[PDB]
Tab-separated table of C-alpha atoms and ligand atoms in Angstrom:
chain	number	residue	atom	x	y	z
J	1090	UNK	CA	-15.622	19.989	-26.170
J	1091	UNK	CA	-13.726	18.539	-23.122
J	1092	UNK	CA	-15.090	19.984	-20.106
J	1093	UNK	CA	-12.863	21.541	-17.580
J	1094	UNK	CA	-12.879	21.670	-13.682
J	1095	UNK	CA	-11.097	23.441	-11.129
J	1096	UNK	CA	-9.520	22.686	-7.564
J	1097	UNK	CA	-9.492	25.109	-4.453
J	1098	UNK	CA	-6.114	23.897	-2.521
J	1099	UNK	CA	-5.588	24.472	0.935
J	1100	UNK	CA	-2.743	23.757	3.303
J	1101	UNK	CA	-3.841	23.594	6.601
J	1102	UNK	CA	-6.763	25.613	5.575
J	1103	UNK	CA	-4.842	28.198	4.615
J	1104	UNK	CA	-5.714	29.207	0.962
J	1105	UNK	CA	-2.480	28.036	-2.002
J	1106	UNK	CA	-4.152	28.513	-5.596
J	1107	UNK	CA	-6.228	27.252	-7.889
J	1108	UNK	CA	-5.877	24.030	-10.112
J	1109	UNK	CA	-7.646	23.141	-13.425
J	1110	UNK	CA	-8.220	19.897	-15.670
J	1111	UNK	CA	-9.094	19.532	-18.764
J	1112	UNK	CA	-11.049	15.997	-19.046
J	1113	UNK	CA	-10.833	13.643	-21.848
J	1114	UNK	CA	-14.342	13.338	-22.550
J	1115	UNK	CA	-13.479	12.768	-26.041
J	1116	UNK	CA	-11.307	9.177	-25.143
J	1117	UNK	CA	-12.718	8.238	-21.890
J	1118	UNK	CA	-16.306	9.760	-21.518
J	1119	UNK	CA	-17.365	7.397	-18.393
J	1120	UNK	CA	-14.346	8.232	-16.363
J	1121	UNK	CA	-14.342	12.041	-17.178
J	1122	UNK	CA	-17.782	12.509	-16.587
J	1123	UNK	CA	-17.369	10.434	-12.981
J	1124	UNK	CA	-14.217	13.297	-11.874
J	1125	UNK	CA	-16.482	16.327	-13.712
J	1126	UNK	CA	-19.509	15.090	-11.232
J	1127	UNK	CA	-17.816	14.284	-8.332
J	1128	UNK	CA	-16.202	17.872	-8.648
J	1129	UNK	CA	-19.792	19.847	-8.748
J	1130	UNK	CA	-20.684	17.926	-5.892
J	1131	UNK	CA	-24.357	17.362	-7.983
J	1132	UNK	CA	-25.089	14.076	-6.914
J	1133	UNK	CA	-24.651	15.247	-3.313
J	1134	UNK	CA	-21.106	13.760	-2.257
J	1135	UNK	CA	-17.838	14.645	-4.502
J	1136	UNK	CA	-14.261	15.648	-3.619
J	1137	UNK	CA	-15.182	19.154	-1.763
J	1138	UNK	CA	-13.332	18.842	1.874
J	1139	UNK	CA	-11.517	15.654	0.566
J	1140	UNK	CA	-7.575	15.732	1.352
J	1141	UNK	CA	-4.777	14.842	-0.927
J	1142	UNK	CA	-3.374	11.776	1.577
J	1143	UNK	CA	-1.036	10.695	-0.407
J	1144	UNK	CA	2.242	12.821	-1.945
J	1145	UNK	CA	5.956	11.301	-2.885
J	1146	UNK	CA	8.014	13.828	-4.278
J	1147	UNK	CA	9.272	12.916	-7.988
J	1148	UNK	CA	6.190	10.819	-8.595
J	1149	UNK	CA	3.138	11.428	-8.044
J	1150	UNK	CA	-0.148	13.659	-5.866
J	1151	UNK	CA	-3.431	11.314	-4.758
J	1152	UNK	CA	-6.830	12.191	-3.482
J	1153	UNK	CA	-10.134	11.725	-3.498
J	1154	UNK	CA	-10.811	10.059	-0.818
J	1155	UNK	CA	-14.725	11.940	0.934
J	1156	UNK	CA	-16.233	8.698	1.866
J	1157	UNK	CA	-13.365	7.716	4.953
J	1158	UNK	CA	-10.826	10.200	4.658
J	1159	UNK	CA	-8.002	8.331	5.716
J	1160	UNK	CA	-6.787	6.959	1.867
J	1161	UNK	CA	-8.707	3.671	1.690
J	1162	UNK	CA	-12.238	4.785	0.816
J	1163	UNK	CA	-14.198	6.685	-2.163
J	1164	UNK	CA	-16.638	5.917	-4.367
J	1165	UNK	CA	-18.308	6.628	-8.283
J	1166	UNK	CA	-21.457	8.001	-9.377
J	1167	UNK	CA	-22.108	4.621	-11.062
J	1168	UNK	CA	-21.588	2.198	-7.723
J	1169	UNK	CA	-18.690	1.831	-5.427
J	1170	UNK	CA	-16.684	0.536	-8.228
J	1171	UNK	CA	-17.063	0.478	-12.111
J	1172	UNK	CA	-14.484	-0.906	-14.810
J	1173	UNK	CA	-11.440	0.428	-16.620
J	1174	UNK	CA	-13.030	2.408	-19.619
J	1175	UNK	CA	-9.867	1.925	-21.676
J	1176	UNK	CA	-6.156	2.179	-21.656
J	1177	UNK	CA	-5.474	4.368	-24.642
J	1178	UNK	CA	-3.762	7.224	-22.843
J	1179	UNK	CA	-0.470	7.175	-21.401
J	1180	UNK	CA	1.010	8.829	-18.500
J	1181	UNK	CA	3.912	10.640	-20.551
J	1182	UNK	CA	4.859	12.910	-18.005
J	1183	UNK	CA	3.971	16.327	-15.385
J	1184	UNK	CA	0.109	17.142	-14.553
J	1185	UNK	CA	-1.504	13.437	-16.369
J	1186	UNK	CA	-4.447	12.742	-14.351
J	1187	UNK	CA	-5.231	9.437	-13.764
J	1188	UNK	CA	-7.711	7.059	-11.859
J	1189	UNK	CA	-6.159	5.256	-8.418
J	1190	UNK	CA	-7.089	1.548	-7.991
J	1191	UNK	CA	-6.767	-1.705	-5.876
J	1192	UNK	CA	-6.565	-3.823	-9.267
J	1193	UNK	CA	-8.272	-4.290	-12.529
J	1194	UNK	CA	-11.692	-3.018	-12.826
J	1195	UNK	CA	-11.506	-1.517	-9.233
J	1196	UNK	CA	-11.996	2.701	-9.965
J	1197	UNK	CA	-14.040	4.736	-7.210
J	1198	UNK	CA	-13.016	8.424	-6.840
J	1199	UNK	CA	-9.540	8.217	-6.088
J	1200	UNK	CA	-6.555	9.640	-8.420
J	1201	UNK	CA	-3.704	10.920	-8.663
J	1202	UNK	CA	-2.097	13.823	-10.433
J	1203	UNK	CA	1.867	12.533	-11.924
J	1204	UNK	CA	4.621	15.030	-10.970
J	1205	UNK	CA	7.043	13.083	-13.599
J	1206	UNK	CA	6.487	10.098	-15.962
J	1207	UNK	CA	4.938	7.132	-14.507
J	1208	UNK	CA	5.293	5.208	-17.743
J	1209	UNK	CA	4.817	1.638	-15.542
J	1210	UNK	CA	1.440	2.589	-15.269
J	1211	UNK	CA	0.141	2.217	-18.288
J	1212	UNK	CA	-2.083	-0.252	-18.976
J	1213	UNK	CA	-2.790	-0.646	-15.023
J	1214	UNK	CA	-4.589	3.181	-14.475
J	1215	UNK	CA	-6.859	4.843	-16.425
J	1216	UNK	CA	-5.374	8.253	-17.789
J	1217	UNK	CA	-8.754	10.380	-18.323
J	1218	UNK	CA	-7.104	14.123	-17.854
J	1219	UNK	CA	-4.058	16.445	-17.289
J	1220	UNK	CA	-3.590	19.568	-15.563
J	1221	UNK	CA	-4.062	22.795	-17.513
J	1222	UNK	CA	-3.702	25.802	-15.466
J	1223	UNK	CA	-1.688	25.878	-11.878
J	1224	UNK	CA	0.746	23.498	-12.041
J	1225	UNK	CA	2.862	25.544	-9.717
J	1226	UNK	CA	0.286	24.810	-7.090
J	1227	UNK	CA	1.064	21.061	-7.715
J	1228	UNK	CA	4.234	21.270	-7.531
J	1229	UNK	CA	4.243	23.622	-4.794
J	1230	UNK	CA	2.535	20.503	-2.848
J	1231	UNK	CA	5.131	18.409	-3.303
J	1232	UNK	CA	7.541	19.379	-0.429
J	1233	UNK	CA	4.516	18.406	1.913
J	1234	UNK	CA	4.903	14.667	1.101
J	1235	UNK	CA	7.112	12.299	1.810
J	1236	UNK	CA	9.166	9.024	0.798
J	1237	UNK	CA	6.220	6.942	1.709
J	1238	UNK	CA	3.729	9.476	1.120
J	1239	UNK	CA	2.405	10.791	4.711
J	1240	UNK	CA	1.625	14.182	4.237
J	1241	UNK	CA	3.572	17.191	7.372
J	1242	UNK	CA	0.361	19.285	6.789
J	1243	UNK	CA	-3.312	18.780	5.679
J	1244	UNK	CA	-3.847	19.402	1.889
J	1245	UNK	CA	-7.233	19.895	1.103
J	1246	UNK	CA	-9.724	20.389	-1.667
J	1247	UNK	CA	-11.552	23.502	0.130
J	1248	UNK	CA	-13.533	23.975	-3.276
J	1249	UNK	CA	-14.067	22.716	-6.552
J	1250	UNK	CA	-16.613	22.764	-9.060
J	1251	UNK	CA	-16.398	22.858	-13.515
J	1252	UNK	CA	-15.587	26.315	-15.322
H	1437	UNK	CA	21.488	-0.939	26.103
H	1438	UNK	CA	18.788	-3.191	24.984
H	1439	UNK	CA	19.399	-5.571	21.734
H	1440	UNK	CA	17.573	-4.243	18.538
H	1441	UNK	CA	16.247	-6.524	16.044
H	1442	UNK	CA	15.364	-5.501	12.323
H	1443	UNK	CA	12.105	-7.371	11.553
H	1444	UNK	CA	10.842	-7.274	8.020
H	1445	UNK	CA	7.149	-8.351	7.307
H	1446	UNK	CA	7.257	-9.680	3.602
H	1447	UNK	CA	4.343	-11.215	1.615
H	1448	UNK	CA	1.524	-11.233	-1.452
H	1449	UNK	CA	-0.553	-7.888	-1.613
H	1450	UNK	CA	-3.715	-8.817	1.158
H	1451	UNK	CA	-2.015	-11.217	3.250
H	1452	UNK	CA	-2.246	-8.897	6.490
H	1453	UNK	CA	1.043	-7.926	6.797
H	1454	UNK	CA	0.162	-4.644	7.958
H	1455	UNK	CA	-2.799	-6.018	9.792
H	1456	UNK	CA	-0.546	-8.282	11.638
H	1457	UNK	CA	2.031	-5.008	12.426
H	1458	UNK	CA	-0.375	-2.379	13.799
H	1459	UNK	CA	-2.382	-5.146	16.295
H	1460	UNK	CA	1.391	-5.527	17.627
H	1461	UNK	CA	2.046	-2.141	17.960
H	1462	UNK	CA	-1.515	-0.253	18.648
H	1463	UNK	CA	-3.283	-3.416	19.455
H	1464	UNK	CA	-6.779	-2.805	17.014
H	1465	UNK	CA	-8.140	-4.268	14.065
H	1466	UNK	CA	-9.771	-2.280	11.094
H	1467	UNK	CA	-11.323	-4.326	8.064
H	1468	UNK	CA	-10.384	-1.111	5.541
H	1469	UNK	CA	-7.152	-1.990	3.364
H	1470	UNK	CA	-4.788	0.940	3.256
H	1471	UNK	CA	-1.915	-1.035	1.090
H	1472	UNK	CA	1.546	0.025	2.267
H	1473	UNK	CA	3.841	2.353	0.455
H	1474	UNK	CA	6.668	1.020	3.171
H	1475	UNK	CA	6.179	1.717	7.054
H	1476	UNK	CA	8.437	1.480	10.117
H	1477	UNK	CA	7.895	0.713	13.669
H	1478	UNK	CA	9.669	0.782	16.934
H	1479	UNK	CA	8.464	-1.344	20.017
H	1480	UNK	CA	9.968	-2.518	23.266
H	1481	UNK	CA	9.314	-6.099	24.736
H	1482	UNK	CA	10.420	-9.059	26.463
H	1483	UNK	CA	11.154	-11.700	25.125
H	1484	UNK	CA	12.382	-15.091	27.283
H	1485	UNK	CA	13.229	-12.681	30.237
H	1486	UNK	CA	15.333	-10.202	27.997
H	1487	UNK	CA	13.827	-6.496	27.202
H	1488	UNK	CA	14.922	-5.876	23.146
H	1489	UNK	CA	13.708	-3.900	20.652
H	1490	UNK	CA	11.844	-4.493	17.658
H	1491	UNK	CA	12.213	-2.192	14.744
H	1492	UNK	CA	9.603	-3.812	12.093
H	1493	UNK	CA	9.545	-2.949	8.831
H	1494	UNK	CA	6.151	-3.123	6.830
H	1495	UNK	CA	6.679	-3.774	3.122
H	1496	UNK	CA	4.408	-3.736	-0.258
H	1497	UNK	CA	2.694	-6.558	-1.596
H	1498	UNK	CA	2.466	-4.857	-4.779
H	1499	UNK	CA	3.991	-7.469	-7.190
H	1500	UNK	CA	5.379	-4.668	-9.567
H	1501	UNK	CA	7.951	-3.470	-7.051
H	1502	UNK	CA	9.540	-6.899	-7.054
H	1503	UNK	CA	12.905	-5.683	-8.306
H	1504	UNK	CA	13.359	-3.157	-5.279
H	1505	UNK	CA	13.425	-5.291	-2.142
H	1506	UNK	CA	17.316	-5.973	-2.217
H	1507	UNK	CA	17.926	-3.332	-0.166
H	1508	UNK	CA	15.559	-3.746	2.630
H	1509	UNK	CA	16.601	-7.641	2.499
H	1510	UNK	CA	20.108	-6.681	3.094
H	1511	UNK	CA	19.721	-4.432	6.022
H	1512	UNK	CA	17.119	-6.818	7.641
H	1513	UNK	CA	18.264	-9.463	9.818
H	1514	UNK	CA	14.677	-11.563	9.992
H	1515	UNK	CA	11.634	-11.941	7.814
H	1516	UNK	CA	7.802	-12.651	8.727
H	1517	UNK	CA	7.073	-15.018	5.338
H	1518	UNK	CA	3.179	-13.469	6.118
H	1519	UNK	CA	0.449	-15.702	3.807
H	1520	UNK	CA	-3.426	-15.850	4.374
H	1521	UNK	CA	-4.826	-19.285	4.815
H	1522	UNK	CA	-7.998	-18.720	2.523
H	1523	UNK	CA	-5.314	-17.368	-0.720
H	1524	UNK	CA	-3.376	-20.459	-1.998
H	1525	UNK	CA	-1.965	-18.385	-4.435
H	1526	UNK	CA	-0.114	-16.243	-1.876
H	1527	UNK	CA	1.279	-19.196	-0.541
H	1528	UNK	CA	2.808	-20.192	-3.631
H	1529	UNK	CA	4.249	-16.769	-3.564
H	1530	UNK	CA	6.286	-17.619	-0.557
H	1531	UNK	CA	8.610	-19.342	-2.138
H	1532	UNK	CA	9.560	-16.843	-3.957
H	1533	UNK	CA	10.428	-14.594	-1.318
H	1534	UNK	CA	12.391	-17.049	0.298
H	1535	UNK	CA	14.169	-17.498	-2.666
H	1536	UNK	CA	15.075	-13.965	-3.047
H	1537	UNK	CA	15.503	-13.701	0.867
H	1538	UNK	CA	18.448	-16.360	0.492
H	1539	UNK	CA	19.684	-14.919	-2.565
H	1540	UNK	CA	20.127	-11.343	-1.562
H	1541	UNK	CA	21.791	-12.183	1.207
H	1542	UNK	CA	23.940	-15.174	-0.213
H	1543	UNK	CA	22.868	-17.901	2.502
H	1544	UNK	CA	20.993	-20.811	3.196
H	1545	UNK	CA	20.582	-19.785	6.954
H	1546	UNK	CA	18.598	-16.249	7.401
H	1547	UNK	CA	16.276	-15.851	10.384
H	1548	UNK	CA	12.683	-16.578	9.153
H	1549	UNK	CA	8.806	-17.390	10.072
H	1550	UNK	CA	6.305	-19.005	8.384
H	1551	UNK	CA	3.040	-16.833	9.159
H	1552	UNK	CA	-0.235	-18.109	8.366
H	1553	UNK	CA	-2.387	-15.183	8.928
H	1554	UNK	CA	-6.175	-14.667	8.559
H	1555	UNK	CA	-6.985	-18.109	10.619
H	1556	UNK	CA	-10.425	-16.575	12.063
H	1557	UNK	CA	-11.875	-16.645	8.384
H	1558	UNK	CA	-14.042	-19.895	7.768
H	1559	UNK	CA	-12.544	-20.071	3.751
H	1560	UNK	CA	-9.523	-21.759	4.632
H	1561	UNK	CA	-7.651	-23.345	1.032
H	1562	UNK	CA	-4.310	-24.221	2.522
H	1563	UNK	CA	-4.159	-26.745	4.920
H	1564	UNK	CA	-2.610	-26.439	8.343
H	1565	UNK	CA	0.192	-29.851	7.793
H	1566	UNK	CA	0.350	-28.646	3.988
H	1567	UNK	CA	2.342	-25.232	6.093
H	1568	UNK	CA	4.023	-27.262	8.442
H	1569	UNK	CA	5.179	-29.355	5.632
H	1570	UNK	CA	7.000	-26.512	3.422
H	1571	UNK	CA	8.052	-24.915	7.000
H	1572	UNK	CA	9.572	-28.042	8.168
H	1573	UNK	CA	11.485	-28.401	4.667
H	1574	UNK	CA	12.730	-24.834	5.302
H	1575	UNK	CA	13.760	-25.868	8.592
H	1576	UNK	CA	11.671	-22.894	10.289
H	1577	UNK	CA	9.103	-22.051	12.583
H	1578	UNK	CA	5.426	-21.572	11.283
H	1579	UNK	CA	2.798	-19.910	13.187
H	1580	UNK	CA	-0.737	-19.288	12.124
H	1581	UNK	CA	-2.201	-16.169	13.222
H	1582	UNK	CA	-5.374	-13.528	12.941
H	1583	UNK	CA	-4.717	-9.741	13.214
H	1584	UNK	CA	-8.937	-10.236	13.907
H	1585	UNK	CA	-8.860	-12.112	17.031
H	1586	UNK	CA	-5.271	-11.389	17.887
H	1587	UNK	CA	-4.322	-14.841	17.972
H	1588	UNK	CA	-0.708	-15.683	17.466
H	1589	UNK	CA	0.567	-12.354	16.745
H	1590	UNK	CA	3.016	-11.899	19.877
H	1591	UNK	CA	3.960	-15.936	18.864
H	1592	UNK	CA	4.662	-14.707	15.294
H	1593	UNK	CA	6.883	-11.959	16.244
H	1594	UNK	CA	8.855	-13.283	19.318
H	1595	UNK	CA	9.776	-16.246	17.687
H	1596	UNK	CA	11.263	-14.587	14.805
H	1597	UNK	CA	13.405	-12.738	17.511
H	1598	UNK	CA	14.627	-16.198	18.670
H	1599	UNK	CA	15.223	-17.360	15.164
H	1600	UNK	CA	17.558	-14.157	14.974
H	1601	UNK	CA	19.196	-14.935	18.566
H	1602	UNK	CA	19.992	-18.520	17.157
H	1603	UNK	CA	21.677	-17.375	14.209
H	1604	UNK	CA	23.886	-14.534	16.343
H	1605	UNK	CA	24.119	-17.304	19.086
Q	189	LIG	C1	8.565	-0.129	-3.812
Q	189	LIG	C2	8.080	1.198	-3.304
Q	189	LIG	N1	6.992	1.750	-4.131
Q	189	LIG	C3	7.112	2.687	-5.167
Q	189	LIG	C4	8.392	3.234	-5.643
Q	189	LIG	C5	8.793	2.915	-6.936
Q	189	LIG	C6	9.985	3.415	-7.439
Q	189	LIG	N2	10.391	3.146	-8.735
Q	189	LIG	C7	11.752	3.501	-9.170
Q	189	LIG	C8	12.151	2.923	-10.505
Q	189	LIG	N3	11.074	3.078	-11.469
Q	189	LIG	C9	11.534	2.726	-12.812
Q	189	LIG	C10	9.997	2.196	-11.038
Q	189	LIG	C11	9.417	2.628	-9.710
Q	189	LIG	C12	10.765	4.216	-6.616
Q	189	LIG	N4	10.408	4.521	-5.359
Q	189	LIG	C13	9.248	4.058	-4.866
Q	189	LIG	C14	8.915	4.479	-3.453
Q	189	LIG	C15	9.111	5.974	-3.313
Q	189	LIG	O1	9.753	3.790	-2.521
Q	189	LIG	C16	9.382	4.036	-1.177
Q	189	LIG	C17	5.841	2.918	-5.717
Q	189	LIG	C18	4.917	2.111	-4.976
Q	189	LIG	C19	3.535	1.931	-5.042
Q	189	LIG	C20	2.917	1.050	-4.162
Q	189	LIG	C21	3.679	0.374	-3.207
Q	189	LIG	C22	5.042	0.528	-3.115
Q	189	LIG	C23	5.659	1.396	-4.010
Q	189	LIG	C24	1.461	0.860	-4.183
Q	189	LIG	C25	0.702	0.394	-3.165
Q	189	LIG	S1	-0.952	0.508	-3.567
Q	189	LIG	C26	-0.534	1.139	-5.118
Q	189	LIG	N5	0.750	1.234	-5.327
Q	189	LIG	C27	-1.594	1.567	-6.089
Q	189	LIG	C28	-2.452	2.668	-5.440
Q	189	LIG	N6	-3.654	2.115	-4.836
Q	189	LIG	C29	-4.332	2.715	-3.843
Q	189	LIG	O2	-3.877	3.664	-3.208
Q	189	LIG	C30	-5.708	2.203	-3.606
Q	189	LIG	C31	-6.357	2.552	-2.290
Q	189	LIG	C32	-6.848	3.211	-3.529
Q	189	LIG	C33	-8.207	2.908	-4.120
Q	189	LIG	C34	-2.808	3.675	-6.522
Q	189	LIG	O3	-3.795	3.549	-7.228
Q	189	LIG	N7	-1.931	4.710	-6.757
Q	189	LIG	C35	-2.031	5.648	-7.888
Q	189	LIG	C36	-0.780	5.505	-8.730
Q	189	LIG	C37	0.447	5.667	-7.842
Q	189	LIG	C38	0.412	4.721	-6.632
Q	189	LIG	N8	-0.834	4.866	-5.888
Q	189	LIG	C39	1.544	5.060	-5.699
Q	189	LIG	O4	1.399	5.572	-4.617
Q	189	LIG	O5	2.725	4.792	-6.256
Q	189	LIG	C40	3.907	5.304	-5.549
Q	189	LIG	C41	5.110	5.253	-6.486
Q	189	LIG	C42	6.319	5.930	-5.818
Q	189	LIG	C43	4.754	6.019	-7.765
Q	189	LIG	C44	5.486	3.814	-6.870
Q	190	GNP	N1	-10.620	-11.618	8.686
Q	190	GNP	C1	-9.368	-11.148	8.652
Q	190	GNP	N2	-9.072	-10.137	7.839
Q	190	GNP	C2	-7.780	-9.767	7.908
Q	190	GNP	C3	-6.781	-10.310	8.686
Q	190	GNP	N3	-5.581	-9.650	8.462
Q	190	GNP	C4	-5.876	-8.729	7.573
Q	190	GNP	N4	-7.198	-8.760	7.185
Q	190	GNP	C5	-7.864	-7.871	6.222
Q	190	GNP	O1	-7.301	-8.096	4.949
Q	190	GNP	C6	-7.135	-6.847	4.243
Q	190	GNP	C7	-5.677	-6.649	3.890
Q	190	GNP	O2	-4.904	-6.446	5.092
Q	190	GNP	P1	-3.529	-5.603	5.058
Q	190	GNP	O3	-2.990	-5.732	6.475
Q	190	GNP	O4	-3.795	-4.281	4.494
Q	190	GNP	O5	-2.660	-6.534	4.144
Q	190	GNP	P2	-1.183	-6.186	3.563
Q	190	GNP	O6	-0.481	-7.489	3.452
Q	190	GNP	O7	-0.482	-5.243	4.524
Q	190	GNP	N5	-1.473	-5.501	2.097
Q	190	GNP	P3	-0.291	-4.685	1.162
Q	190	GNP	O8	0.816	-5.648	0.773
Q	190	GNP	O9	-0.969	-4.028	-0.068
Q	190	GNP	O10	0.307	-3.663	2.056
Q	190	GNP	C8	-7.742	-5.770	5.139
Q	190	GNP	O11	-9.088	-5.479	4.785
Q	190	GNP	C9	-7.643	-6.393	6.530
Q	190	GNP	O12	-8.637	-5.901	7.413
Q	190	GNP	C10	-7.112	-11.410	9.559
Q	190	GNP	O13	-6.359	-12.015	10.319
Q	190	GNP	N6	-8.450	-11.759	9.464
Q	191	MG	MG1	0.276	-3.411	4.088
């Protein structure tokens, strides 16, 4: 059974809602169970306190970033880096999950949750997850990005952990 | 007032085209790589006696956007061609932008630079005549440079403000 995890978002620390994923175990077991541990937090570093640096309206919400926290860092429980599992999964539309990266065989902790199809990306990011519950609090982050991305207030992960 | 100039830094993902940006505006260095959604700047200088001002644009690298520059190559008036000396293969990709530079805008004479960026590093793979070779066939400046060490980075930029100057006479 595909676990599921849950986001605490913030704005300016200020409490917006709760989102959950449900994580493909079942297609891409290494790259869910890298998101389900970096959301616990168990091996002692994971996306609690992390910011979502990146949002463009009509595309797309990233994250993930706890090693630098200024959109160029991150890191798996496997290494700094570890390969593209597969490309199986598409990103089809609203709440896909799906691993950031600086090129092939380049995924550390970053991702990004798609506000609309990103069918482009298939092939290039691996699609391990999807929002189940809250996506009014992603789309309710939305108006706090921008055309290039830069965030007007601080979104933050204030908690996370699996259900 | 002063002149403005519309600067557009153009090149392969990596190159430093950012790099090259931020030492001319905030004067630092950092080794991390943030690539660029698309960034704008605004600076004042002097250039040859005359105070102007440079509004830069920083563009992507990323290769899959290469079907959305038209715009931002018809509102620009002069391009940093921005390759790193240790990447041969992004400066076979300068070509290309010329190409498309000239094409968009429907003329064999737009304001450009030939930037060979990253000269600190000890890797180099393109040699410094093979640059002034293509440069001199383009009938433009090139200037190598490092965001590191600074070097060339005021060069890069004020010349491509004369290259626009020329062309306006
Ligand atoms: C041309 C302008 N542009 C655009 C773009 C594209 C369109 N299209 C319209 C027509 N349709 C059919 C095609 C696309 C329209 N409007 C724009 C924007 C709004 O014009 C300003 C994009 C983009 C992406 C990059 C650079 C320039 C870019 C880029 C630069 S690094 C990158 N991608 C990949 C990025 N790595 C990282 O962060 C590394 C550091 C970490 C480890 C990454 O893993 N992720 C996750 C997936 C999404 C991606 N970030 C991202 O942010 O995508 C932005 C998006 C808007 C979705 C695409
Ligand atoms: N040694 C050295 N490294 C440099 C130099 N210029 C940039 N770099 C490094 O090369 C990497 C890429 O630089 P960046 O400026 O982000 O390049 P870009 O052309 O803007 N990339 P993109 O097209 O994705 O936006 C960074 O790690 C940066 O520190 C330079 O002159 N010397
Ligand atoms: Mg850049």
């Amino acid at each position: 059974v595909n676990p599921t995890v849950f986001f605490d978002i913030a704005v300016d620390g200020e409490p917006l809602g709760r989102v959950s994923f449900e994580l493909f175990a079942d297609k891409v077991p290494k790259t869910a169970e890298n998101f389900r541990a970096l959301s616990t937090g168990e091996k002692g570093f994971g996306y609690k306190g992390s910011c979502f640096h990146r949002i463009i309206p009509g595309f797309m919400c990233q994250g993930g970033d706890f090693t630098r926290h200024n959109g160029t860092g991150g890191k798996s429980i496997y290494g700094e880096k570890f390969e593209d599992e597969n490309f199986i999964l598409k990103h089809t539309g609203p709440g896909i999950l799906s691993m950031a990266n600086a090129g092939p065989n380049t995924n550390g902790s970053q991702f990004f949750i798609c506000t609309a199809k990103t069918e482009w990306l298939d092939g290039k990011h691996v699609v391990f997850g999807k929002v189940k519950e809250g996506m009014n609090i992603v789309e309710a982050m939305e108006r706090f990005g921008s055309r290039n991305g830069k965030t007007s207030k601080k979104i933050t992960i204030a908690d996370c952990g699996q259900l | 007032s002063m002149t403005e100039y519309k600067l557009v830094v153009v090149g392969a993902r990596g190159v430093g085209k950012s790099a090259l940006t931020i030492q001319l505006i905030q004067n630092h260095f950092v080794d991390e790589y943030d690539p660029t959604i698309e960034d704008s700047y605004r600076k004042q200088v002097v250039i040859d006696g005359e105070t102007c001002l440079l509004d830069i644009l920083d563009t992507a690298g990323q290769e899959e956007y290469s079907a959305m520059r038209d715009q931002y190559m018809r509102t620009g008036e002069g391009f940093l061609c921005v390759f790193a000396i240790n990447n041969t293969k992004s400066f076979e990709d300068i070509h290309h932008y010329r190409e498309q530079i000239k094409r968009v805008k429907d003329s064999e004479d737009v304001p450009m630079v030939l930037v060979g960026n990253k000269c600190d590093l000890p890797s180099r793979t393109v040699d410094t005549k093979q640059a002034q070779d293509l440069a001199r066939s383009y009938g433009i400046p090139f200037i190598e440079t490092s965001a590191k060490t600074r070097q060339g980075v005021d060069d890069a930029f004020y010349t491509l403000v004369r290259e626009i100057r020329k062309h306006k006479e």
